[PDB]
Amino acid sequence: HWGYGKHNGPEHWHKDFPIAKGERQSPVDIDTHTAKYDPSLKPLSVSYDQATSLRILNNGHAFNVEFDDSQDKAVLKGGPLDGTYRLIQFHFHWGSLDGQGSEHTVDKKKYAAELHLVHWNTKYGDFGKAVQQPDGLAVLGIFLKVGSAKPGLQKVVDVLDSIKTKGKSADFTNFDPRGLLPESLDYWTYPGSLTTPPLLECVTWIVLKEPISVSSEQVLKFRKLNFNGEGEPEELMVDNWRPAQPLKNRQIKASFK
Ligand SMILES: NS(=O)(=O)c1c(F)c(F)c(SCCO)c(F)c1NC1CCCCCCC1
Ligand SMILES: [Zn+2]
């Protein structure tokens, strides 16, 4: 039942998912002035050389690019993390207009979209068990602004026409997610949650400071996707973002300056 509309959208989620009002919900606004520089934070280590993408799927809420995570192929480590976290999928959240679409905000600024690369802590053996643990997941979030095209996104954008409606999927091999990163790996980090139901409080959030640029043509193609399934009334897949939630009793740490 949950979704992103007036009747089932973020302000309703708490009724099925009481943790919506919990103590470590995501996303948040990143107050860049109150984020504490922490010289003990390590460089983030992003090892995507061996990533094996499998499939791309429209689930009715967003689209997911899935990876084979049955061995240590694409991993995130260091940064604020202990251990090794395996990439399982990436997805995006975006707006009906370029002035909104990101879930995290930076001194209240919305970006056109936000990419989330979702990784799970290999000490919990699989993703289902990891989401039940307070350090189960590390999600790397990257802002998108509109300007020049991102060449390494085009393969994603071109296949979207083939997964237009809910439940459609396509083969999606040999996609390299290093094509989606910006130059710098400076980050903020905080303890938070999934941003969609079940809203589990299991995420170490790592949000890059530097956005990537994507073209208006690229983001426009995102907005041509549908929330409905084939042969239902067209509801464009836009504004699939959860707004900033109360920071509460949490500190956002910066890797830089
Ligand atoms: N937004 S997020 O990065 O915190 C996030 C996770 F980290 C998750 F681990 C999950 S669990 C599903 C894994 O495929 C999740 F749904 C989302 N959110 C969903 C966003 C909207 C569209 C539904 C598709 C799955 C991602
Ligand atoms: Zn997300």
Distances (CA, A) of 99 to 89, 154, 220, 223: 26, 22, 13, 14
Q: Binding site for substrate: residue ranges?
A: 195-196
| Atom of ligand 1 minimally distant from the CA of 131 | 9
- HEC secondary structure over the chain: CCCCCCCCCHHHHHHHCHHHHCCCCCCCEECCCCCEECCCCCCEEEECCCCCEEEEEECCCCEEEEECCCCCCCEEEECCCCCCEEEEEEEEEECCCCCCCCCCEECCECCCEEEEEEEEEHHHCCHHHHCCCCCCEEEEEEEEEECCCCHHHHHHHHHHHHHCCECCEEECCCCCHHHHCCCCCCEEEEEECCCCCCCCCCEEEEEECCCEEECHHHHHHHCCCECCECCCCCCECCCCCCCCCCCCCCCCEECCC
- CATH T-level assignment (fold) for domain 1-257: Carbonic Anhydrase II (3.10.200)
Q: What distance in Å separates the CA atoms of residue 122 and residue 98, rounded to the nearest whole number?
A: 37
One-letter amino acid of 222: F
What experiment produced this structure?
X-ray
| Atom of ligand 1 minimally distant from the CA of 61 | 22
Is residue 33 annotated as part of the catalytic site, yes or no?
no
One-letter amino acid of 218: Q
Half-sphere exposure of 20 (CA within 13 A, CB side): 15
187: closest CA among 4, 24, 38, 6?
Answer: 38
Q: Binding site: residue ranges?
A: 91, 93, 116, 195-196
Q: What distance in Å separates the CA atoms of residue 233 and residue 158, rounded to the nearest whole number?
A: 23
Q: Which residue CA neighbors atom 13 of ligand 1 most closely?
A: 89
Resolution (A): 1.8
| Atom of ligand 1 minimally distant from the CA of 66 | 14
| Ligand 1 pocket test, candidate residues 2, 91, 93, 132, most atoms within 8 A of CB | 91
Instruction: Give the distance (Å) from ligand 2 centre to CA of residue 92.
Output: 6
One-letter amino acid of 68: D
Q: Indicate which residue of 33, 61, 104, 119 is catalytic.
A: 61
Evaluate whether 255 touches 79 at the Cβ level (below 8 Å). yes
Which residues, chain by chain, have CB under 5 Å from ion ligand 2?
Answer: 116
Q: What distance in Å separates the CA atoms of residue 53 and residue 6, rounded to the nearest whole number?
A: 34
Phi-psi region of 239 (alpha: psi -120 to 50; beta: other; left: phi over 0): left
**Residues with C-beta less than 6 Å from any ligand 1 atom:** 59, 61-62, 64, 89, 91, 116, 118, 137, 139, 194-196, 203, 240
**Pairing status of strand 36-37 against strand 253-254:** parallel
Distances (CA, A) of 147 to 45, 64, 209, 242, 246: 27, 24, 17, 24, 31
Instruction: Give the distance (Å) from ligand 1 centre to CA of residue 103.
Output: 12
| Ligand 1 pocket test, candidate residues 56, 64, 116, most atoms within 8 A of CB | 116
Collect contacts of 122-125 with beta carbons under 8 A, ≥24 apart. 122/72, 122/75, 122/83, 122/84, 122/85, 122/86, 123/83
